[PDB]
Design a protein around this ligand. Structure first.
Ligand code: ZN
Lengths: 67, 51
């Protein structure tokens, strides 16, 4: 839904790296290079951001007040 | 117009359309096989051991 605060396996803070990851991928990096530029060295950290499906932007199209 | 009974017929002609086979009988045109998975180029060791 929303980016997890910590990695599940080790407790590395990964929640502050989602917008940086999207800005690196829009700047035409490879996903492996974009995960290197964030310092995600263990693949436990690296699947937390690689495989994240961000359902909150789809879930906020139904935003109620529309005002 | 007496409409007498005539004799028995000799045979039978039968007209029907024939299909065209200049197209078929050609070498077959199958769907091309999808490639087997090939390793991507530019794979490097990204993880270096700590310390
Ligand atoms: Zn981790």
């Amino acid at each position: 839904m929303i980016i997890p605060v910590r990695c599940f396996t080790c407790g590395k803070i990964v929640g502050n790296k989602w917008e940086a990851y999207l800005g690196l991928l829009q700047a035409e990096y490879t996903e492996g290079d974009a995960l290197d530029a964030l310092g995600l060295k263990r693949y436990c950290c690296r699947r937390m951001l690689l495989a994240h499906v961000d359902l909150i932007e789809k879930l906020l199209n139904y935003a109620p007040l529309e005002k | 117009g007496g409409l007498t009974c005539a004799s028995a017929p000799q045979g039978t002609l039968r007209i029907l359309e024939g299909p065209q086979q200049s197209l078929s009988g050609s070498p077959l045109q199958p769907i091309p096989a999808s490639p087997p998975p090939q390793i991507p180029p530019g794979l490097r060791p990204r993880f270096c051991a700590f310390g």
